[PDB]
Amino acid sequence: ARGPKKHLKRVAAPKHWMLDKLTGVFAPRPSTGPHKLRECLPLIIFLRNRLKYALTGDEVKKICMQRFIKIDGKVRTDITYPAGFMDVISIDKTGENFRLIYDTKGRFAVHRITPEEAKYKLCKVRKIFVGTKGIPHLVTHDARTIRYPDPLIKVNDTIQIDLETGKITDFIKFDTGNLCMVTGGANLGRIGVITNRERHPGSFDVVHVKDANGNSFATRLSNIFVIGKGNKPWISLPRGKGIRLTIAEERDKRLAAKQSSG
Amino acid sequence: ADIQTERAYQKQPTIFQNKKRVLLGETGKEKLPRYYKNIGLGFKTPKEAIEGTYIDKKCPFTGNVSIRGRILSGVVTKMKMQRTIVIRRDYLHYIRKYNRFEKRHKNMSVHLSPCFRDVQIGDIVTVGECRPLSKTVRFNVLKVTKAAGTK
Amino acid sequence: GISRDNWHKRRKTGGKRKPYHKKRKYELGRPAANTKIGPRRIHTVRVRGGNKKYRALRLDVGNFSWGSECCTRKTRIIDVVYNASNNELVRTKTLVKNCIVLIDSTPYRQWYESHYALPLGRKKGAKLTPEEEEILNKKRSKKIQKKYDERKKNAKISSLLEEQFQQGKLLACIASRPGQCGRADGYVLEGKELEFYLRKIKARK
Amino acid sequence: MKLNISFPATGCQKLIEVDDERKLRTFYEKRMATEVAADALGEEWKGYVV
RNA sequence: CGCUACUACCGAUUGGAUGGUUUAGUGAGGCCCUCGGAUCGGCCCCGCCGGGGUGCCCUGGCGGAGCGCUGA
RNA sequence: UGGUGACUCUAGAUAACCUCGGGCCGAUCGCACGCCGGCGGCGACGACCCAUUCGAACGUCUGCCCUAUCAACUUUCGAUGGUAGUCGCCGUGCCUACCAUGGUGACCACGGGUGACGGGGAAUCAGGGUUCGAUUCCGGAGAGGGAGCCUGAGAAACGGCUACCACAUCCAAGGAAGGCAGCAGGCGCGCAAAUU
RNA sequence: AAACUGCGAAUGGCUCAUUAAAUCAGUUAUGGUUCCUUUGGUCGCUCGUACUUGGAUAACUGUGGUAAUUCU
């Protein structure tokens, strides 16, 4: 093709959007932005498919153009704006705050947070570099650049950003024994304590993680997002606490819940 | 020896050899430090690279080549090119219908830095991937292991 | 309007290759900037991404550095004397990277005389031109005079450079690419590199 | 040959049909943007240059 | 062998119609280069009525008939 | 200063250059209104630069149908490598000049054929396989055939331009205008496929 | 309304002619590159008429040419 593509076929859309197949030919192509195309949830999918606040894309536009939707503390009127991991969505008209947080199935849950929690977000620092006559700079997964970070902050650490001012207020190092979520791969959405990091120079480091129920998995280092110091998260977690039940336990839990009614 | 064999002057681009030094303060030659780097992945810089005089811009150790990508091995098959050898990689390809294998081989042209003196035909070479160095060359010899029968 | 694709070439086996598409714009090439020596003439080229290349068609002046003295000066380029790629480029006096040129020695001579208080390239029969014996000698106090005397201990210049300064033009290598940046910057030849290039020039002529 | 003649000082234009070669050879072989005395076009055109 | 039908093959019937490939020569058009310079515009001279600056003609409106520069 | 497995990285310092086809350092627009000539809130738009996103491009390793009534092929009409450059967004015989004589091949090179776009996939199928995949998703290619460009971040674009080749429209004969392998629809082709 | 300016028109749709390590697939790399837009940062970091500078050109008015055009 010549130049960039502007459309997204509904069936080539990320499967975690949980789009059906008969609504249309196209899926809302996420706009360029802080998060990657396949690692984001567009505002239209959140406000229409997840929250059911709108029935069509026209109503999503009508909501967004009234400036009711804030993403990370800023009003966004782009209905395909890419909202991704850790992003805080505030709807002040209805007085509700959400944080885009993965499910254990790898999907962005509708996770409501308190207005006090909506003041900050965790960000995994993607790189640290010196520029502009010795000024240290830090780049996060959110793609926000921060000048003058703490000298102890390194790549793969997690910082806490106050959304009102956008400066670092705390940080967790990437250490063994720290709680972390998985943001990609087969184990996407799982939460556990980092056990050990096997280093492969010139290749991908593998991080082993142990669930709160004792289940051990492993991912690439690029898929690890440190959540809290020790085993205590710095953010609220969804109803499932990052523990991925097998299909047998899911079936048993569903049957127990169904048999408890009636 | 005779490093200057080409029409243009041969030197390491990062080494300045024209510094002013008084005559009476000479210990050995005036000034010619040799540029070399240690490539990663646990490979050892050959002694000939550190104490050599050859000029090779495609050398992994004293040149302008960064090794990144695949680390492969092969047996030296031909050494009839200037600073380049042809190695042979043998492998077995699985045919599923017959549940069997077949011998296939690929010839790969790799750059041989003059730091590996006394490289024969038939000995193993560990090559690393770099940027395209010529039309067909994309790998640099990083290690040389002698053949079993070589005394 | 030439091309730069790799698929019009034979394969490693020597077999012929079939083009599966027509020429693409990103595989384009442009005519060479045969940068002559003459009054400055540069044509800006719009390149991929919207950036600019400076295609120098004529350059009479460059920026050349005396590395041992760390003396970088703007200097007229006089002639092209050696080309390792093609002798024809010398015959046409084409400025390319790594071509050996003659540059005016006056700026470096001026810096040397104003820094070391020592004559350079000056004939012994002459007794200096008016209004420059001052900068050579001047009226300095004890501190400034001892500073220049301390500098005088490291003011020795190699005989090859000295002879060049007598002739009034230095040998230099162009280190920038005039057809891409519009500039002929470089460094004065010194040491064994100067020896090699003098040997090559005298073997050629 | 028709003549679209303009007076910029008042901004007034007029097209006049001049089908006499005598009145037009004063303009022949003359290139654009050259002032020429349009005397031949008539007595009322005496002293005008176009 | 005689018939009848069908099918390939050989071949100068010096057979008729398109498809391509290529020595030699010519070569549109674009792009680059070296020139070119129709025109157009600025500063001093038959633009010289007018200004917070008075017999300081020096303008912010008209070929200012200029081998005078200058840019496009 | 920081970073990488690994820089000729990042940052710093010095000597200077700093493209007339000359780069950044705002002569911009709205709303709300103010405060003892000055100080201002909320935005819109624009410009470098650095990240980010969306990519593109170019490389790595492995994998493709039939054919030997195709066994040798390539070789400065660059073929394989070296040195220097040119050009290019950049690595590179991409091209050029010198130098070396290389490089591929029965483990099937090279040549030829394909009623051959590749893949995800489809039909059938005990196990194994056989055949198909123009076709809605991904990647490529093309816009009658070639070639060449302009603009632009991005096109060698064809619902852009320029030319030639084939076909073809209007004409007052001077000229002018073309590109349905877009959606309908028509002709032709055919065993074979829908509404201007 | 028009017109100037900006942006898009390089996406989409169609088709499978070309194409036999070519395309493509998985796997890596760009430490060998470009990147409109989005998002974040930087944007008194330069020691050298401003309470806003200059000339045009559309649209519009008016005069036209050609048989003929989204010509001018």
UniProtKB/Swiss-Prot annotation, chain A:
InterPro entries assigned: KOW, Rib_uL2_dom2, Ribosomal_eS4, Ribosomal_eS4_C, Ribosomal_eS4_central_region, Ribosomal_eS4_central_sf, Ribosomal_eS4_KOW, Ribosomal_eS4_N
Keywords: Acetylation, Cytoplasm, Isopeptide bond, Nucleus, Ribonucleoprotein, Ribosomal protein, RNA-binding, rRNA-binding, Ubl conjugation
GO biological process, one term: translation
Matches recorded under CDD domains: KOW_RPS4, S4
Coiled coil spans: none
Modified residues (N6-acetyllysine): K232
Subunit annotation: Component of the small ribosomal subunit. Part of the small subunit (SSU) processome, composed of more than 70 proteins and the RNA chaperone small nucleolar RNA (snoRNA) U3. Identified in a IGF2BP1-dependent mRNP granule complex containing untranslated mRNAs.
Protein name, per record: Small ribosomal subunit protein eS4, X isoform
Organism lineage: Eukaryota, Metazoa, Chordata, Craniata, Vertebrata
Originating gene: RPS4X
Curated annotation (Swiss-Prot), chain B:
Modified residues (N6-acetyllysine): K37, K44, K57
One Pfam entry name: Ribosomal_S17
CDD domains (UniProt xref): Ribosomal_uS17 (cd00364)
Modified residues (Omega-N-methylarginine): R68
PROSITE patterns: RIBOSOMAL_S17 (PS00056)
Phosphoserine carried by residues: S66, S109
Entry GO CC: cytoplasm; cytosol; cytosolic ribosome; cytosolic small ribosomal subunit; extracellular exosome; focal adhesion; membrane; nucleolus
Alphabetized InterPro entries for the sequence: NA-bd_OB-fold, Ribosomal_uS17, Ribosomal_uS17_arc/euk, Ribosomal_uS17_CS, Ribosomal_uS17_N
Coiled coil: none
Keyword annotations: Acetylation, Citrullination, Cytoplasm, Lipoprotein, Methylation, Nucleus, Palmitate, Phosphoprotein, Ribonucleoprotein, Ribosomal protein, RNA-binding, rRNA-binding
Purpose: Component of the small ribosomal subunit. The ribosome is a large ribonucleoprotein complex responsible for the synthesis of proteins in the cell. Part of the small subunit (SSU) processome, first precursor of the small eukaryotic ribosomal subunit. During the assembly of the SSU processome in the nucleolus, many ribosome biogenesis factors, an RNA chaperone and ribosomal proteins associate with the nascent pre-rRNA and work in concert to generate RNA folding, modifications, rearrangements and cleavage as well as targeted degradation of pre-ribosomal RNA by the RNA exosome.
Subunit text: Component of the small ribosomal subunit. Part of the small subunit (SSU) processome, composed of more than 70 proteins and the RNA chaperone small nucleolar RNA (snoRNA) U3.
Gene that encodes the chain: RPS11
Curated annotation (Swiss-Prot), chain C:
Segments of skewed composition (Basic residues): 7-25
Modified sites of kind Phosphoserine: S159
One Gene Ontology term, aspect cellular component: nucleolus
Disordered: annotated span: 1-26
Gene3D superfamilies: 3.10.290.70, Ribosomal protein S8e, subdomain (1.10.168.20)
Cross-link (Glycyl lysine isopeptide (Lys-Gly) (interchain with G-Cter in SUMO2)): K169, K192
Quaternary structure (record): Component of the small ribosomal subunit. Identified in a IGF2BP1-dependent mRNP granule complex containing untranslated mRNAs. Part of the small subunit (SSU) processome, composed of more than 70 proteins and the RNA chaperone small nucleolar RNA (snoRNA) U3.
Name assigned to this protein: Small ribosomal subunit protein eS8
Lineage, opening ranks: Eukaryota, Metazoa, Chordata, Craniata, Vertebrata
Curated annotation (Swiss-Prot), chain D:
Cross-link (Glycyl lysine isopeptide (Lys-Gly) (interchain with G-Cter in SUMO2)): K14
Superkingdom in the source lineage: Eukaryota
Disulphide bond pairs: none
Subcellular locations according to the entry: Cytoplasm; Nucleus, Nucleolus
UniProt modified residues of type ADP-ribosyl glutamic acid: E35
PTM per Swiss-Prot/TrEMBL: Ribosomal protein S6 is the major substrate of protein kinases in eukaryote ribosomes. The phosphorylation is stimulated by growth factors, tumor promoting agents, and mitogens. It is dephosphorylated at growth arrest. Mono-ADP-ribosylation at Glu-35 by PARP16 inhibits polysome assembly and mRNA loading, thereby inhibiting protein translation.
Family: Belongs to the eukaryotic ribosomal protein eS6 family.
Role summary: Component of the 40S small ribosomal subunit. Plays an important role in controlling cell growth and proliferation through the selective translation of particular classes of mRNA. Part of the small subunit (SSU) processome, first precursor of the small eukaryotic ribosomal subunit.
Self-association and partners: Component of the small ribosomal subunit. Part of the small subunit (SSU) processome, composed of more than 70 proteins and the RNA chaperone small nucleolar RNA (snoRNA) U3.
Descriptive protein name: Small ribosomal subunit protein eS6
Organism: Homo sapiens (Human)
Gene: RPS6
Residues included from the entire protein: 1 to 50 of 249
